[PDB]
Design a protein around this ligand. Structure first.
Ligand SMILES: [N]S(=O)(=O)[C][C][C][C]C1234B567B89%10B%11%12%13B85%14B%1158B%12%11%15B%139%12B%1061B%12%112C5%153B%14874
Ligand SMILES: [Zn+2]
Length: 257
């Protein structure tokens, strides 16, 4: 199966998922001087007050927090989007050291980690149908840098020992994802793909300019996770990021001047 190692990592994925070499793959480097300010872009509408978290899961590639997406409770609208997108889950990508871990880069800068809040378009009715459409998903990406602790992340941090290895899940109710957001909703946007198999070209990316700060202790707990299942040879879940892919025939737009 696919992973992030030498023999199964990103350079291999195209064999099982040939769209890996497609025309709208993610992530990309965001060249800040080339991105064009688009005054037609709307403010992003992030409506998370009725979010209902369910479970936290280690799936062997990241950890994720899953939400009830059976009604319009935690939705993304506006910005570059037409219609309403329901929050399904969030997860992270991170490095072995603080100088790598993000998927998107900004003028070639890599952040220590990247948070992805994954949403799907309710007009396609379910996420499996949405992933087959060019406007099916909207992923909100937020960079993490290491400095001061993010208080809203601590509840996540402190349960990671209970999902150390692949397979493992736990109850994770009453988690408020508003506590993971930076002050500003200024963003870059472009059409792209899932950054993990199946690499489907179904995503409107919305990448926030302002990173959140997390502490060294917080990210160190991410790195204590394992890619492997319980009792198997221990391989730290680190460097679970896909590198930047060719931009090709795409424009990155900025919501801000
Ligand atoms: N890193 S990322 O945010 O680009 C990928 C998000 C993958 C989200 C999924 B799509 B398929 B299935 B549908 B449902 B399951 B599988 B992939 B994951 C979820 B949706
Ligand atoms: Zn992701």
């Amino acid at each position: 199966h696919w992973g992030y190692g030498k023999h199964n990592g990103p350079e291999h994925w195209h064999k099982d998922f040939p769209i890996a070499k497609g025309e709208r793959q993610s992530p990309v480097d965001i060249d800040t001087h080339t991105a064009k300010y688009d005054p037609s872009l709307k403010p992003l509408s992030v409506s998370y007050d009725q979010a209902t978290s369910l479970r936290i899961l280690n799936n062997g590639h990241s950890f994720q927090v899953t939400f009830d997406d059976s009604q319009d409770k935690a939705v993304l609208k506006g910005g570059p989007l037409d219609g309403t997108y329901r929050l399904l889950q969030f997860h992270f990508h991170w490095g072995s050291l603080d100088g790598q871990g993000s998927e998107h880069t900004v003028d070639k800068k890599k952040y220590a980690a990247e948070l992805h809040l994954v949403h799907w378009n309710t007009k396609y009715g379910d996420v499996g149908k949405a992933v087959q459409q060019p406007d099916g998903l909207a992923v909100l990406g937020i960079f993490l840098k290491v400095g001061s602790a993010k208080p809203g992340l601590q509840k996540v941090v402190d349960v990671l020992d209970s999902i150390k290895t692949e397979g493992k899940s736990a109850d994770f109710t009453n988690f408020d994802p508003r506590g993971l957001l930076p002050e500003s909703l200024d963003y870059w946007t472009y059409p792209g793909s899932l950054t993990t198999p199946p690499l489907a070209e179904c995503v409107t990316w919305i990448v926030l300019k302002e990173p959140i700060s997390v502490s060294s202790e917080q990210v160190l707990k991410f790195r204590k996770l394992n890619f492997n299942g319980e009792g198997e040879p221990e391989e730290l879940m680190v460097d679970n990021w896909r590198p930047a892919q060719p931009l090709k025939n795409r424009q990155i737009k900025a919501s801000f001047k």
